[PDB]
Amino acid sequence: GFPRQCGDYTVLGILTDNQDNSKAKENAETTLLRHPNVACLVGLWSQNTPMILAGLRSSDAIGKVAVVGFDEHPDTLAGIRDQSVYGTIVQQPYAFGYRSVQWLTTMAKGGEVEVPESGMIIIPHRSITGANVNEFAADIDAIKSGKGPILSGEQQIDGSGVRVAYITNSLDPFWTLADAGCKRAAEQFGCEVDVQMPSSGSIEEQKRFLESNVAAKVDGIAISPIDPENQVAMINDACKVTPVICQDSDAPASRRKFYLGTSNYLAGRAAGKLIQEAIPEGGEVMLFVGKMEVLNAQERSQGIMDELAGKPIPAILQ
Ligand SMILES: [Ca+2]
Numbered sequence: 001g002f003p004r005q006c007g008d009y010t011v012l013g014i015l016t017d018n019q020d021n022s023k024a025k026e027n028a029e030t031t032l033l034r035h036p037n038v039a040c041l042v043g044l045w046s047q048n049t050p051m052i053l054a055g056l057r058s059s060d061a062i063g064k065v066a067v068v069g070f071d072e073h074p075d076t077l078a079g080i081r082d083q084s085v086y087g088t089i090v091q092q093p094y095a096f097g098y099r100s101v102q103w104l105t106t107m108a109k110g111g112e113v114e115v116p117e118s119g120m121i122i123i124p125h126r127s128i129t130g131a132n133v134n135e136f137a138a139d140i141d142a143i144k145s146g147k148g149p150i151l152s153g154e155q156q157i158d159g160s161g162v163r164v165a166y167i168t169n170s171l172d173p174f175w176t177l178a179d180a181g182c183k184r185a186a187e188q189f190g191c192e193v194d195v196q197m198p199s200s201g202s203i204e205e206q207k208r209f210l211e212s213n214v215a216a217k218v219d220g221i222a223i224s225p226i227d228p229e230n231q232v233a234m235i236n237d238a239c240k241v242t243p244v245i246c247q248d249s250d251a252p253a254s255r256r257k258f259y260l261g262t263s264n265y266l267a268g269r270a271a272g273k274l275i276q277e278a279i280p281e282g283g284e285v286m287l288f289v290g291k292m293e294v295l296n297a298q299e300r301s302q303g304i305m306d307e308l309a310g311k312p313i314p315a316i317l318q
Pocket of ligand 1: 082
């Protein structure tokens with residue numbers, strides 16, 4: 001129940017808008033009006049921070065309340081640059097593609113990939129603030145012009161003769177950065193990567209990619225399954241002949257070797273840290289999201305509150 005005391009912070013509630021932009025803006029406006037002491041507004045989904053800023057502008061309150069968000073909507077980055085948004089937490093699709101190619105090429109060459117018993121490798125979020133937002137935009141520019149960073153540093157891997165496949169779940173812009181990551185790793189390691197995108201986002205399209213990769217005898221496959229419960233068989237058939245890993249979305253019931261993805265819970269803890277840096281003295285916090293029935297909204301808000309409360313992480317590391 002709300003309000004909830006989290007250390008020196010009071011989470012007043014989680015306001016839902018069902019992705020209606022004008023309702024998201026209204027929620028921000030009524031929050032400012034009914035809670036004159038509110039200190040930070042937090043947008044849990046990509047659109048919420050732009051509508052928080054819209055509500056602050058209508059209330060003449062830009063800069064009077066701190067703002068923290070998720071993702072890199074252009075209005076969110078503009079707000080970071082003009083200091084009305086303290087920072088935002090973004091995913092790293094480029095590292096999804098790059099590391100998938102890196103780890104599949106390493107296994108194809110006999111090397112080992114350290115994977116925990118959970119079978120999950122967490123690709124780190126990125127925290128963007130006013131202090132590093134120009135470094136972020138420069139990184140994105142470099143990536144788009146085909147000169148993205150070599151995440152593997154000095155580590156040499158001879159991937160010539162290795163052929164791997166990288167299967168997305170759609171033609172979303174998220175996959176354009178991952179595609180650049182695949183091609184940068186392939187150039188770095190000398191391997192060949194087939195980036196395969198299901199144009200209409202159906203499992204039947206992914207099934208034909210999987211069967212083509214088996215017929216081509218690829219050395220490894222990374223896939224973001226569209227409907228994991230109903231793709232266990234087709235993934236297992238590929239696993240019989242070649243290593244399959246999951247990326248971005250997981251099929252934990254299948255024979256896939258491991259999963260790499262984002263931890264929305266740890267992304268929430270990172271946003272909790274941005275809140276703490278935006279208002280070190282504490283105060284009232286309001287969260288905003290489309291709906292709370294979605295898993296990533298539950299994980300992001302729970303991570304925020306656990307971080308503000310200083311909740312100790314029951315963790316395994318070895
Ligand atoms: Ca600036």
